[PDB]
RNA sequence: AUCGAGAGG
DNA sequence: TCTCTCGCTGAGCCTCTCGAT
DNA sequence: TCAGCGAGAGA
């Protein structure tokens, strides 16, 4: 297989043995398709926006001989693009123009938020993600109470008809063996009442269900239900149903029938969706799978008959927690639902206005008011339970958040309502939902992550690919199978061996059928899996040697990989899985090449590519201009940066990585650093799970990170003592004023320490950095003052140079009024006014950049669930050293390997030692300026190692410069890739170690740094990949002595932001009581808080050196007494 | 002020739930006042009396009459009776638990250089916790004339401030508590020492009481203020007093992990080591020989040791004798206090042996010798565990050859059970029980066989003849120690992983006949995920 | 300065005695100005002055003048903390039943009177409270006991 | 409501009765003070 | 010795909860009053001087009550 | 101060 | 005298971040 | 939602 140049620079060795047929699909596809359906123009009108418009319209006008008709809709060009929306802080949305005729004009119907290329919306300058929802599909479901309803223990079967939109409907039993129909989960009534309501006489009811009642094969439940039935006429049943629905319950004949009709048999009030209709017919065994949305009496009779049969024992009860019963609603469907709700709300007012007669004056634009539609859309995009804040720690975090599915949200389970069955996994989760990746808090089991190959059907049911098996030979075509269809067939295992012809070598092959795994003959197999990594999600597939870890530790490692902070200098993982490239490319943090060509110009902030001849358009200039992102904060205050990874004149193909985003290294995902770890106890500085770190790691800034913080100063409008921004500050030093400019705003690039003035104290606590960016917004109409005049001048001067930079390069490849007109509007944007919240004079935003370096108290971790806290920064002369004199970077405790069952870290340590041995050999060969032939020989001998490898890299095709560049990039260690469940075996690791002239066992003799004496036993040392999680002791440390207090209960507030104290809860009070500590409790209940006079008296006493307290009565008791007295109950203190 | 109109940054003012309920009640009452004055018909006057009753219902104990009143959003309003009952009521949020001043919170590290009654805290925490004391003593020394000047000196952080702080925190104890205070030992008083950093340093022996690890776990610190509080912390709260748990007679401060790892390695013997068969003057010569390298730590030697006993009435009497021991035991003998028998250290010291030794020291001598002995034990265990250089490797885990044999016989048995169930002689539940029993027996058998192979299989030669001995394998030492790990972890590392259990019950799908040394396949891992889900759900929901 | 807590029912005269301010007619809260509106849920005459040692009317603002009523508004000058103590009352045109006694337990009114909870529930909701009050006044405890 | 109906009385004998109102609990070092108060009565 | 453990200090009194003797009277009269410590200070803060005094055997409830009676007379 | 959503122990 | 529907009570602790009312 | 408990229903 030929290699792309970005792949050609550094080729990661593969140990996989199973050939792969299906390439990894686009990861974010699930978030891109659905929203596309929401905005694409469909002539059939089946999909979201046009379907909603067609369903709501036309307007009948209520017999007034008027009508309203619409032709089509279009999406206008957005006012701003993504970036300006991010800076100014407005929503990235497009206007929705729809053209209508009245029986012609375009009417504005609000603005629809748009999805960016990655798949994240911009709502108020902050990127947000709408999570897919896993909810039970509309249709009919038969369930049982499992005998726990009553002490008798008899199973109480029931049936439920869940609509996509409408009211529920239930048929259930009682231990008396009688039907009972429940509407909207209200009180029970005899079911035959509804049969009365449907124009059925008693004779017809008895004729429908009977032919003759026996003991086991048939049951006289209908007769008993009719006997219990109080009503006999249709009108009485209808008025009783009305009384159930309406507590007041006036008789009002000719109105109850309207209620019963509109309850279930009206399109505008009740609708069973096409998926619901299909599931309904499939459950009730009907050949046709399309029909009317509204329910029908035949359906009610048939579902009642099916429930009677299931109770009788003819059928089988369904399983609620089956992935063929649950379906996924993405962002497009939810947005369509909300927009339809808004359209109904507005059409109500359209009918109301059309009721009155207006001739020659009414216009289509005039009647429609878009405010409710805009309000509903805005509420959904910004206040829903599924429109969550983005996770922007690293690309893996972004992808995992975007590929999440939640069982919560509207029309879904609540945390308390969830049992112990919805949290457990199901045998149908294989290949559709990851069994590993899940939270550990209250939400476990209720939130999942999509599998790598998982796909969604047109209805919404998850399906997974499989390879067809024909005539006992495995073929290459793939079919996508859903949950229902999988059971009927038999599926072979991905680990089965082949013969290069498709024939199964094994006589009996492992397979899974109907949810159970067993051996099957060769001829019976009908399908096969595509890859060994088909089960795990992306995060779980990024863990090497996953098959050797305990599922708990794999879960913890997958969760912690999403918390790693992007370091200062990215470093590739020496041992990986080969899935890093896909994640890095599909994340969207990198800059990929749209078209091939040659890099004409490279810079720290721009790239210009000269496109090849055959790719350019006939009229296009033929250049591609990429602008990079430099030092912009993320949601979690981390740093987002892009660095070019190409030089002048390099050839570029399609899809090559031009620039590397955060936590990326030449188009690969790089989350942490490689460290030399030795597993041994060292004077108890790694006692429980602590980590001992050398001083070289701190010296080389291997874990230094950049954090960017945003601070805002807003000058409010007040009649008395109005706020101002000016350098004049009463009672301040000369230096503090000097650091400020004439305008009173801090100079860009200045170094500020905690307690300094940014805008004329404001920089908080101990965090200190450099001012990298200052933005200013002023209310429209008010003229800018001082510095803001210069800021817009520099922006305007740069804006001309910015755009003219593309104008000059574009003109280099190749009347003038077409382009300059855009410049005038671009010039207006900076100079014009800006939107601000009412009651605000001006707002200045300042960004600070702080470099955080590791110190004791910082949590660090690995990829196998092994976390810890740095306990000591040991000097270099104290670390244990090898015979050659090279010290180790990290010492880890071997206590945590047996109990915390992750041998994966040991295997990764051995393989990393082998890889770094190969890299050291290559570096030694390269430093002596040996001949290129020896480099070719050694590299080829290294690459050809293995038992039966699928990679087959040949260096004969490589030229001298190519192999020289590859060797230069391979000097720090040859990377190795092990697939998730088909990876390197122990024998191959031993052979690779033997090739690099290192001990086979993987353990070497170490020497004590302090005494220079040999350790008694050999020590396991190697290279392992470590991450720095985003839990830094710099932020968790807090302390309080005396600050501000709450209002109603005079106690200190809670939280580090408000400078509040810690909480002394009930259990601590119980502990103090158990010790018998009576004075400490009395001071922690009265003096330390909640007593107004005790605090001041004790503070004065402590200041004066007297440690004596005079406790009183807490204010909380006073407020309790006052509120109880307010409630109307007299309570008082008697003496 | 009990229902505040809290000010807001913007023009609008936030409104509590009580104010609007009172407003509605006043509205309905005033409607009834004017309407009855106008002599309205009896039919209409009765209607809003029901509304007034409903409003009074809503004002106090809302939601009992059904259809609880909702405000702007779809959330029921909060009534007077909701400020009393519930988790967020005044009883269980502001009276049985409060938020206290003079306190802080931070992460915890190990710092194994401390004594049993000491904890290390950062300077930046102390300078904030002890501000009033610093103000008072700055006024006393005459450096400042008012409170404001001393305050400014505190922000400026001069050297006088650091000297005063060093003087202030000399003997005030501080209370450290973790987040879940399950029992009485969850909060303890320590004597503080200033350290440079941002994390609190906690004595290694105390951790087992707190259930406190160092995986980013945090802790909270409070400072006693008054004289009686200081004495209360010193006499009843200090960690030196809490030697025994209140639930039973066993002690709480028991060496674990690395300490035991060093200790039994010191005390374990080997055959034909370097320096075996030598006579020594005492423990000092043993230490000199070990540090010089003339003899091994596991050599079997004879030492002339002297032991004190308290068998005499209220007195100590000595006896000296030649005893056959090992060198490491001779060094270990040098830290035990006067008045204990030798046989407490003439054996391989597991966790149980060390705990029993501490219990005996407390029973016989007292409390101060017990504290000193615990500190010495921790120091010696750490030092010799470090010098041990014991590591875990992939070649350490060993797999036997009887495992596949017994798995095959168990598979034959379960196949016969399936054949029996295929016939109508037996039901489903009985077959389920039979299969689960068979597989449990097979798992026990494989665990026994593998542990036997790990334990016994070490052969060394003495003067040219073979002999067997207890293994020095790292994994077997880790398991036999009791420091961390059990027989289940080792058996799952070198036998069958066993039978998994769903959150409700057990599952008998297949035998997972694959170690963690030789990797699992996809089906076995999918089966194994059930137990992980069950464990996490059980924890978080029980 | 106390040794016991005594809890009992509150008579209407006791509630009327608790109030420091006259009445609660006007339903208003604030926003006529930044000063609180007269007789409102946040008031000056009823619940005390809002500013320490200063009256709302602004006649005097000195602690040497403490203990004097106001002339423009009639609000006595006192430390603002007293706003955490004072109370007031609302007079209902028609008596209203306390939900705590009628519900949330075996009904106390339902055990004073023999008829079950449903009858009293339908009587209160007009499907009146004055009738229940008259019935509760009608009985004599010793005779029925 | 039962206490209000019955007109009960609380002597503040236990632990939470003193903790809620902010006094010395009748155990440990507060036992002597409680005993002195009882003996005075 | 005395700073680490108070077992010898409580052996003289016999009741651990009777620390009111050490704190409420001795340490207070040392800190606020003009009373001079008996044993040498050794730069120790108060409340450790008193514990040392009870440990050796100069301070107990009867002795402090007797002394209080002595200063009662004029 | 609430609500919603995450996260840690 | 007693077996059954219907209602109301409860469901661990501490800490951090963001947005939106 | 599951799991119990007391008062009220007829049978
Ligand atoms: O929901 C929770 C989770 C955790 N905890 C508290 O954290 C502890 C579990 O979380 P830890 O991860 O800190 O303890 P661990 O040592 O058992 O886990 P590993 O290092 O082996 O990975 C618990 O013992 C408890 O103190 C809770 O109190 N509630
Ligand atoms: N904390 C806070 N509450 C607000 C703010 N604006 C309004 N509220 C509260 C006051 C009312 O309870 C409610 C009014 O919301 P309305 O705009 O739907 O929300 C605000 O900026 N901050
Ligand atoms: Mg922990
Ligand atoms: Zn006045």
Numbering used by the authors:
A (entry chain I): 1 to 103, 119 to 226, 337 to 885, 918 to 971, 1021 to 1341
B (entry chain J): 248 to 789
C (entry chain J): 16 to 142, 181 to 198
D (entry chain J): 1333 to 1373
E (entry chain K): 1 to 74
Describing publication, verbatim:
Artificially Expanded Genetic Information Systems (AEGIS) add independently replicable unnatural nucleotide pairs to the natural G:C and A:T/U pairs found in native DNA, joining the unnatural pairs through alternative modes of hydrogen bonding. Here, we investigated how two components of a synthetic AEGIS base pair: B and S, can be selectively recognized and transcribed by E. coli RNAP in vitro. To further define the structural basis of base pair recognition during UBP transcription, we solved structures of three RNAP elongation complexes containing template–substrate UBPs in the active site. Strikingly, our structural studies reveal that the trigger loop can adopt a fully closed active state in all cryo-EM structures.
Our biochemical data showed that UTP can be misincorporated opposite template dB in an in vitro transcription assay. To distinguish between these two scenarios, we solved the cryo-EM structure of E. coli RNAP containing mismatched dB:UTP at 3.28 Å resolution and derived an atomic model from the density. We found that the configuration of dB:UTP base pair in the active site is consistent with Watson-Crick like geometry, but not the reverse wobble base pair geometry. Intriguingly, we also observed strong density for the TL that allowed us to fully build intact TL (β′ residues 916-1146), including the insertion motif (β′ residues 943-1130). The dB:UTP base pair adopts a Watson-Crick like geometry with an active, closed TL in a manner that is analogous to a canonical matched natural base pair. We found that the dB (imine):UTP pair in a wobble geometry loses a hydrogen bond as well as 2′-OH interaction between ribose and R425 of β′ in pro-gate loop. On the other hand, in the reverse wobble conformation for dB(keto):UTP, there would be a strong steric clash between the UTP and the pro-gate loop of E. coli RNAP (the conserved region of yeast Pol II (β′ 425-431, rpb1 440-460 in yeast Pol II)). In our assay condition, we found that the UTP was still incorporated effectively with two keto-dominated 7-deaza-dB templates, suggesting the dB (enol) form is unlikely the major driving force for tautomerization in dB:UTP Watson-Crick-like base pair. Based on this biochemical evidence, we modeled dB (keto):UTP (enol) in our structure. Our observation that the B:U base pair adopts the Watson-Crick U’s enol form, and not the wobble base pair U’s keto form, serves as an example of base pair tautomerization during transcription.
